[PDB]
Write a protein that binds this ligand. Structure first.
Ligand SMILES: Nc1ncnc2c1ncn2[C@@H]1O[C@H](COP(=O)(O)OP(=O)(O)OP(O)(O)=S)[C@@H](O)[C@H]1O
Ligand SMILES: [Mg+2]
Length: 452
């Protein structure tokens, strides 16, 4: 029984163990709760976010603990209950999302153990915590941190309650760390060091101090046009990131003026299938302007792209993020500082156009500061879909500035991100970034004109 957990023996309203995989927190807590039940007539609620069947709960772990220590003859074991025959202590097992009503009605709970608590949503906490209201009752929590902004992390680490005993552990704190897990761990440490730190050292995902777009801006910008009462006006712009020859999904983004309407991923496609997919989406979206990344495997797509739009007045622009910024000799607008003095290249230029729109939108939504909707950006959540919106947000928050020896704004490249961060190429984020750019001049009545 790892001495690190000794503080959980003392009385505290909150006992929270956070750590990486194989750290021993589950075995330690099960052991302590079993020893408590042997000695006090405690009612113990074992809760989790989702319990689709009893096998998803800790009941088996508790049974194994009982048998391991040789306490079997002291207990009654049923499908969904464990009871001590001497104290009448009782364990019960419920999923919060499954049985919210049952949970609210439970009486006399002395200890609540929330396991796998990283999955527990704010709404679940808000249901569960008020029910554990007996004087001297305790809430025990074990979790492997996910994102620093997830409720469980915010609730117990960043903005903690009174009387919390917080322990942080990892596999190095587990004197019984088994070989099978050690092998997985060392394998991971070598293959993906960043992932290893998250999984095995229990470090939550959080924003780099070099990140350019904050999660909270993206949350505010979600349906900002509904929140603030404006609607989409402008051209429809679509963009395609053809990715590479690797596994990473291709990307597509489309907006109608300041309202983003579609974020799509292209899986198991070659370069031509991907271009066909993306140009078809652009047509379906009624695009006036289409861009695609020409810096890599996309450099040869011009003919297929313009062919796909034949007969339709849709501009087609090859975006090369490595090029000097668009309009680089023009004055920069937030002796004269030019756009070219500020941005190293187009990739930086348009990622900052995106970030600037998002920040303005954030200040409008959250701080009530006025801004022209044309300068904002809103995500139409119903149109895009929660699933793809979340995928996009997870990529956008990883886009990082890097040091630049001429004091220009420059971002880590997709290749660098994969190498350093151990993540797939952020192709949805790049597709969205590219649709920030509108270099082709057009009118219903006129030619397409591409100044340069
Ligand atoms: N007190 C102990 N005695 C014997 N073996 C232990 C003990 N504590 C941990 N272990 C072993 O270490 C392994 C991991 O412990 P766990 O408690 O399951 O860690 P964990 O932090 O809950 O892992 P995650 O986040 O579930 S993968 C167990 O499967 C046991 O094999
Ligand atoms: Mg565990």
């Amino acid at each position: 029984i790892n001495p690190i957990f000794e503080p959980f023996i003392e009385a505290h309203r909150y006992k929270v163990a956070k750590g990486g995989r194989g750290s021993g927190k589950s075995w330690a807590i099960a052991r302590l709760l079993v020893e408590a039940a042997r000695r006090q007539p405690v009612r113990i609620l074992c809760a989790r976010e989702l319990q689709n069947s009893i096998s998803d709960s800790v009941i088996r772990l508790l049974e194994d603990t009982i048998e391991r220590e040789g306490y079997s003859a002291e207990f009654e074991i049923q499908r969904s209950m464990i009871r001590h025959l001497g104290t009448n202590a009782e364990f019960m097992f419920y999923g919060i999302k499954n049985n919210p009503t049952k949970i609210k009605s439970l009486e006399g709970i002395d200890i609540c153990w929330v396991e796998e608590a990283e999955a527990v949503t704010k709404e679940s906490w808000d249901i569960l915590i008020p029910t554990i209201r007996k004087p001297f009752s305790e809430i025990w929590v074990s979790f492997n941190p996910k994102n620093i902004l997830d409720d469980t992390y915010q609730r117990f680490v960043v903005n903690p309650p009174d009387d919390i005993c917080l322990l942080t552990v990892n596999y190095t704190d587990n004197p019984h760390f088994p070989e099978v897990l050690r092998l997985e761990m060392e394998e991971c440490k070598r293959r993906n060091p960043t992932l290893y730190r998250h999984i095995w050292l229990g470090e939550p995902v959080s924003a780099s101090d070099m990140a350019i777009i904050k999660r909270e801006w993206l949350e505010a910008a979600t349906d900002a046009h509904k929140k603030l009462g404006w609607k989409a006006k402008g051209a429809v712009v679509s963009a395609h990131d053809p990715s590479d020859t690797g596994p990473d999904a291709k990307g597509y983004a489309s907006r109608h003026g300041s309202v983003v309407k579609r974020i799509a991923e292209g899986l198991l496609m070659d370069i031509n299938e991907g271009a066909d997919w993306a140009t078809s989406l652009a047509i379906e979206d009624g695009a006036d302007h289409y861009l695609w990344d020409g810096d890599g495997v996309g450099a040869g797509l011009r003919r297929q792209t313009t062919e796909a739009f034949s007969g339709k007045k849709i501009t087609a622009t090859m975006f090369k993020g490595s090029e000097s910024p668009f309009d680089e000799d023009a004055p920069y607008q937030a002796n004269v500082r030019t756009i070219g003095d500020v941005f190293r290249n187009k990739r930086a230029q348009f990622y900052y156009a995106l970030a600037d729109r998002l920040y303005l939108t954030y200040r409008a939504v959250v701080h009530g500061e006025y801004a022209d909707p044309d300068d904002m950006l809103s995500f139409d959540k119903e149109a895009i879909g929660e699933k793809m919106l979340e995928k996009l947000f997870a990529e956008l928050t990883q886009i990082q500035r890097k040091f630049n020896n001429n004091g220009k704004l420059e971002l880590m490249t997709k290749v660098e991100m994969k190498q350093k961060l151990g993540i797939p190429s952020p192709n949805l984020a790049d597709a969205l970034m590219m649709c920030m750019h509108c270099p082709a001049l057009v009118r219903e009545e006129t030619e397409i004109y591409v100044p340069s």
